[PDB]
Design a protein around this ligand. Structure first.
Ligand SMILES: CCCCCCCC/C=C\CCCCCCCC(=O)O[C@H](COC(=O)CCCCCCCCCCC)COP(=O)(O)OCCN
Ligand SMILES: CCCCCCCC/C=C\CCCCCCCC(=O)O[C@H](COC(=O)CCCCCCCCCCC)COP(=O)(O)OCCN
Lengths: 600, 600
């Protein structure tokens, strides 16, 4: 909770400290007035208790002022309460915004392993729950607990000074009883609510499972059994809600019984004190009204405490996400790439594996030269979908040297590297947003003319104008769903916008159509063919790897051989030959079977 | 709303009428006491306002009784309120149960078209919303509206008889003002809450779309843009909640201002009436306390009215689902099948189509003889997945005669028919329940020994004992997910339990493995081969249709020819030949390509 008091009382920002002190003053004055009200009511009652001789005179001003003060005190108490609410909301929402944004800025900075291990739904639920918890905690600790505590103290002091300690004793005892009673009975009612929600979700699941499969529900005549299961679940839910209502009745009745006993006993004490000439009827009114005022705001407090501990747990969970440490950090003396010459990714004595038990890439030592569209190939598990993650600095090498331009990779700024490293991923994503925004994603700092030029260069205009809304469609799960080729050309356009020196085509064409694959390859070779773009195809369908100036083969996480397609295909025993023959026969059978299918 | 007053005041059930009258009596007495309380307080104040001469006497009993009556009246008012709540809950939940069950009993009785047109999520949401609406309507119309109306009337009568009409005028005017103010300001606050929820869902969607695609968020360095979108959405949400809190402050402050003006003006009227020797200070107390009691329960009522109209709309929607009419009804003079001889499904001059525009099955006239495992075959759209729906009486024939045993189908009881008509559907369903229950589904009135015998006959025991929990696994979407063959043998076991005379295998093997298909066929031919089970295979893979005694071919929704496999395959020009050759070459290429794949 300390970090919370750090987000609402920081070091340096005076605006927030002042807003908080103002909320404090408003709270204090609100309670002062809520307690002064009865005193004006009593001064009224004790100024009217005279023997009026002339029943035609006007109301003296000494009493009109008292009545007016009574009214303005009521109004001012409630008003200051609500103003405190408004102000401290202005504060708590700033705190929530700040913490959520700092957390999200961290997550975008952690390593990848910490994201692949953990679940995303869990992270989002944690953020939401911790935020609601901060809100509820500040609420219940400024709106319901601190004010009522101040009021109880003021009331006990009033009743101890004016009349005696007996009233303060009775009031504090009543408060203790009310509190513990409410807490325990609320636990009880929570058990009942849990049971009810369970038995309602059950019935809903049954109704669903029965209406979706109506055909099978009727193919066997089993509709009465379903109605009976539904009746049983509904009866359980009925009984549970019955018990919930009865328990709420017990709760409210017991609370009112407690406060009624307090008020009645205090009326008796005041009525036996009046006999001693000490007090006056106005004092009975004062006591009853003070205690009832104490009673008014206690329902809410007794309710909220139920939720405070879960909210504190959620807050701790959330605040924990920013305590995690980053392993991939900008090593000392960050630099900037030469950014004036071609680039290389020469490896040296590399050894890397996700989990330290099963190494995937072993003693690899190869060379990605300058301006030569190298091609990696192997098996899924032979360490070819990992070169990217290892050059993009998502992980580090275990006793390995990722040498770029004769200089290690752990010496540059991770961002100065990731900014000149572009990728065409296998299954590109699409945010729940437009298609113009998802393509601006490549370089937000772009002019719309550049965006349209690249969208046309990627052969996408025929597919964007074909849609209902021009450049404003809604893509993603929560919207339109386009197929593979479109997504791949979209990712290609993103890359075109990035305009990087080194490109990694991570299986751009994994599961698509033959002619769509050929179109993608044609576009890629028409755009990414200059002699100033180090290209690297992480491919497993050699049908596309024919023009590369260096083909690297990885078996059992080790480099085997190099050379051009025709060069090594003619070499005895090379895996290139077996793989090529297998893929060729596979494509033969594939296209033949597809022709047969479209026949049928 | 009338039907509601029919479900809580039926004709014949005296228990419910009596429970309701008791709730009524409790409500009335609760308000009587909540209004008598101040009179005891005033009798107290006006009995203590004496000149006590001996300040050592005890409290007379004439005042102790008054104080005790005051306390028991408070407690009894609240107690009767809560008892009314409990009782009318005991009633409303019975009503909810009854209406939900009757609705679900109807849906299981409607035709199929009404289910295929409409959406299931919509039906379930409608049921849930209408149920919550019934609950909320009864609540707000027995707990918040009727009681406060009775109390306002009683208060106006009291203040009109005892003192004068001015107080009743002020009180009723105050109530009008409070009501309309609360309504309008609540509409306002609802607008603000809508905006806030929108801008929070937006931010959550952004966080999701950014954490799921973290790889692509980093492959382009676009994390600051994401943080900025998040900051913008969070700022909108912040401002919206600020305005919500300020508006709630305005609301509560205005309400308290209204009631404060009422109380203060009434104190002034009472204090200028006391001058006329008419009233006494106790009357000022009486007035203030009565009006404050009126004020206490009004927040809730002012809130709920927001939700009452949507709830009435939901109730009407729900109650509408039982007004729909059934077209497939048990025609006059329902009968029972002979149930002592083999069965036939001889058609005659049939003509049927889902939508009257595009007929699918035209002038069909064929014969499904007794004990002959007939086989239908054609194209998906040639009218072969419809013979079932038309013999199972999910639809009716347009100028067609579905003759069974020389007698029409519209003459028997739909259930006496559906009970001797079993089906093995293509994609069988699985409820979110066990595997022993989903197999008991076939015949709930079965002995566990029969269930296990058939589960073994279906060659399923190897697949039920292979799982963690024996006969108690959790299947379905919300649980374990088994593959095709298991589901098909499960549906087969269901049928085995039904033990019907006529069976329809509706593409039992559509998309499975070769050996799994052969195993399913072997099981089916081992079980369903007796000479007393009219079998009908609605199949499109003739590789299984070789042993049937009658193969029917449907082209363009018309019967073409008949005969045994070898009989018509040797016939010139028969579609059987083309289809057989195509499927054979297709299976050849399929298995060859699969061998090639498992090579690679
Ligand atoms: C999180 C926990 C924090 C706990 C902090 C609680 C501290 C409060 C403790 C004790 C306060 C009790 C003081 C009451 C003494 C009684 C004085 C009194 O009776 O005066 C009342 C009105 O005062 C009034 O209106 C009573 C209100 C006066 C209270 C002022 C103290 C607050 C100052 C701010 C403290 C941060 C009027 O009485 P009268 O008949 O008009 O004349 C009597 C003499 N003038
Ligand atoms: C959905 C809308 C339905 C609207 C129906 C509302 C009908 C109510 C209309 C008028 C009722 C006003 C009657 C009050 C007359 C005043 C009588 C009165 O002052 O008696 C009060 C207590 O009575 C009391 O405690 C006051 C409560 C008595 C009320 C009894 C009437 C209810 C009967 C049930 C009706 C269904 C005590 O006054 P006291 O000083 O002790 O002596 C005066 C004479 N005994």
């Amino acid at each position: 909770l300390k970090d919370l008091f750090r987000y609402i009382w920081p070091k340096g920002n005076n605006k927030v400290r002042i807003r908080v002190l103002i909320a404090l003053g408003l709270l204090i004055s609100a309670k002062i007035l809520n307690v002064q009200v009865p005193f004006f009511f009593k001064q009224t009652i004790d100024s009217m208790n005279i023997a009026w001789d002339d029943p035609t005179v006007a109301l003296p001003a000494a009493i009109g002022l008292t009545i007016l003060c009574y009214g303005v005190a009521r109004f001012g108490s409630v008003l200051f309460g609500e103003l405190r609410n408004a102000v401290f909301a202005k504060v708590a929402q700033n705190a929530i915004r700040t913490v959520s944004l700092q957390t999200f800025q961290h997550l975008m900075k952690l390593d990848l392993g910490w994201h692949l291990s953990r679940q995303t739904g869990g992270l989002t639920r944690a953020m939401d729950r911790g935020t609601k918890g901060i809100s509820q905690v500040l609420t219940a600790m400024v709106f319901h607990i601190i004010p009522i505590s101040f009021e109880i103290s003021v009331v006990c002091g009033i009743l101890t000074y004016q009349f005696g300690a007996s009233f303060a004793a009775i009031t504090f005892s009543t408060m203790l009883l009310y509190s513990i009673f409410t807490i325990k009975t609320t636990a009880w009612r929570t058990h009942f609510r849990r049971d009810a929600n369970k038995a309602d979700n059950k019935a809903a699941s049954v109704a669903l499972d029965s209406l979706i499969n109506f055909e099978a529900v009727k193919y066997f005549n089993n509709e009465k059994y379903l109605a009976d299961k539904y009746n049983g679940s509904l009866m359980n839910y009925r009984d549970s809600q019955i018990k919930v209502s009865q328990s709420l009745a017990f709760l409210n009745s017991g609370q009112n019984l407690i406060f009624t006993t307090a008020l009645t006993a205090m009326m008796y004490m005041g009525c036996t004190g009046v006999i001693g000439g000490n007090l006056t009827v106005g004092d009975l009114v004062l006591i009853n009204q003070l205690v009832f005022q104490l009673s008014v705001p206690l329902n809410f407090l007794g309710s909220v405490y139920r939720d405070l501990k879960q909210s504190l747990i959620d807050m701790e969970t959330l605040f924990k996400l920013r305590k995690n440490e980053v392993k991939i950090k900008n090593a000392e003396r960050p630099l900037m790439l030469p950014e004036n010459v071609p680039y290389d990714i020469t490896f040296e004595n590399v050894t890397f594996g996700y989990h330290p038990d099963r190494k995937i890439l072993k003693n690899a030592s190869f060379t990605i030269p300058a301006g030569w569209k190298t091609a990696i190939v192997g098996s899924s598990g032979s360490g070819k979908s990992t070169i990217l993650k290892l050059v993009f600095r998502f992980y580090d090498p275990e006793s390995g040297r990722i040498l770029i331009n004769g200089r290690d990779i752990k010496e540059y700024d991770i961002d100065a590297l990731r900014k000149v490293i572009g990728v065409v991923p296998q299954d590109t994503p699409l945010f729940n947003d437009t298609i113009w925004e998802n393509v601006k994603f490549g370089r937000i700092d772009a002019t719309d003319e550049e965006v349209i030029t690249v969208v046309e260069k990627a052969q996408l205009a025929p597919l964007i104008k074909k849609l209902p809304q021009g450049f404003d469609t809604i893509v993603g799960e929560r919207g339109l769903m386009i197929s593979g080729g479109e997504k791949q050309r979209l990712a290609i356009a993103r890359v075109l916008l990035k305009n990087a020196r080194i490109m990694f085509f991570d299986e751009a064409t994994s599961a698509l159509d033959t002619h769509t694959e050929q179109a993608l390859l044609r576009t890629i070779r028409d755009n990414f063919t200059s002699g100033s773009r180090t290209s690297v195809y992480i491919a497993h369908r050699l049908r596309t790897i024919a023009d590369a100036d260096k083909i690297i083969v990885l078996d059992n996480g080790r480099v085997r051989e190099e050379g051009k397609h025709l060069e090594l295909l003619a070499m005895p025993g090379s895996l290139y030959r077996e793989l090529w023959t297998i893929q060729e026969d596979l494509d033969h059978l594939e296209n033949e079977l597809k022709d047969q299918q479209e026949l049928w």
